[PDB]
């Protein structure tokens, strides 16, 4: 198995497709770099466990994801060779250009790549410039403009320059924010610098929207992995490019489905690692940021919690408050006293009703 050509392909597709260490929901059960497990979560974990050779519980290491990737590369290579429209192109290409073709197969399947009849012809004929121009005219160039440009450059040059240069630009940028006492992460100072460079306050909602798009785990913490993967997925190689992405992130929250996802992420981001709940003071601080102009009883809710609850906020209570905020009438007349709401919200309605 180890005799086959080589593994710059793993990092190439880690940049283009991304690496997920936990079982993710695909448009179904997927892990690593696009590795399909089945078509029940118990069956997905069963397939993953048998493939890895341990009880993973849905979480794998980078090396474990690399092993699944190599199996997917080999499967793709076999498929390409069994395809009459792809094999003559594949056989004729060098190791680097073969990797760019496998990348296309990973993204749209063999049928989709086969559709580029005129472009494949130019590639087989070693007309690199003509193929680079023709592949840019395609719709594939608009779906993934960052990925497509990288793949086109790989076919045009026969080098890893597009991926090397992006990693170099991001690595130099990372050096400005990294902690002097720890290279693998961005400290308090670095986070402040990053926010300063974006001309935003670190406690602002815009920074919280960024954290949501970066899928950052904890507030006041920012790892090299989060920075590298976040910037690449957002198609940004500089602070200016990330700054220009903020209006689109804002517009996305005007859709309720995306707002629910962002609101629920805020709980996970705001909490202290090792704690299941969110401290009252921290919850109120984040509620005033995410529910500002969405919940009429927000201040009365805060006043109620500081005077009557004085305790931690669980995940379910956090999630359910968004549902309460959107259904509740201005006079609270539509509130169901025996309608599944947590005790805390029942007590809030009882406390708030005499104050109209
Ligand atoms: C001790 C400490 C850092 C602190 O003051 N924590 C509470 C306040 N939190 C913030 O100001 C955080 C700081 C940030 N953490 C990260 C982590 C990752 C990123 C990347 C770029 C995505 C960015 C930031 S900024 N800010 C936020 O959580 C955004 C609202 C603060 C006090 C009360 C108001 C909210 C929390």
Residue numbers in the entry: -6 to -1, 1 to 21, 24 to 35, 38 to 164, 1062 to 1251
What does the article say, verbatim?
The cullin-RING ligases (CRLs) are the largest family of ubiquitin ligases, which regulate the turnover of ~20% of cellular proteins and play a key role in normal cellular physiology and various human diseases. Neddylation of individual cullin proteins is essential for the activation of each CRL. DCN1 functions as a scaffold protein and upholds the neddylation complex (RBX1–UBC12 ~ NEDD8–CUL3–DCN1) through interacting with both UBC12 and cullin 3 proteins. To gain precise structural insights into the DCN1-inhibitor complex formation, we determined six cocrystal structures of DCN1 in a complex with 6 (DI-1548), 7 (DI-1859), 4, 8, 9, and 10.
Installation of the same two soluble groups onto the α-carbon of the acrylamide in 3 resulted in the methacrylamide derivatives 6 (DI-1548) and 7 (DI-1859), respectively. In sharp contrast to compounds 4 and 5, both DI-1548 and DI-1859 display very fast covalent complex formation with DCN1 protein. Within 10 min incubation, 100% of DCN1 protein has formed a complex with either DI-1548 or DI-1859. Interestingly, judging by the observed molecular weight for the complex, the morpholinyl group from DI-1548 or the dimethyl amine group from DI-1859 is cleaved upon complex formation. The tandem mass spectrometry data confirmed that DI-1548 indeed forms covalent bond with Cys115 in DCN1, accompanied with a loss of the morpholinyl group. The contiguous electron density between Cys115 in DCN1 and DI-1548/DI-1859 confirmed the covalent nature of these complexes. Consistent with the mass spectrometry data, the morpholinyl group in DI-1548 or the dimethylamino group in DI-1859 is absent in both cocrystal structures. Based upon the mass spectrometric data and the cocrystal structures, we propose a concerted reaction mechanism for the formal SN2′ substitution reaction between DCN1 with DI-1548 or with DI-1859 to explain the observed fast reaction kinetics for these two compounds. In this proposed mechanism, the morpholine group of DI-1548 interacts with Cys115 in DCN1 and facilitates the proton transfer from Cys115 to morpholine with concurrent formation of the C–S bond between the ionized sulfur of Cys115 and the electron deficient allylic group of DI-1548. The morpholine group in DI-1548 thus has a dual role: first, the basic nitrogen interacts with Cys115, making the sulfur atom more acidic and facilitating covalent bond formation with the electron deficient C=C bond of the enone; second, formation of a new C=C bond is accompanied by breaking of the C–N bond, resulting in a loss of the morpholinyl group as the morpholine group is at the end of the allylic system.
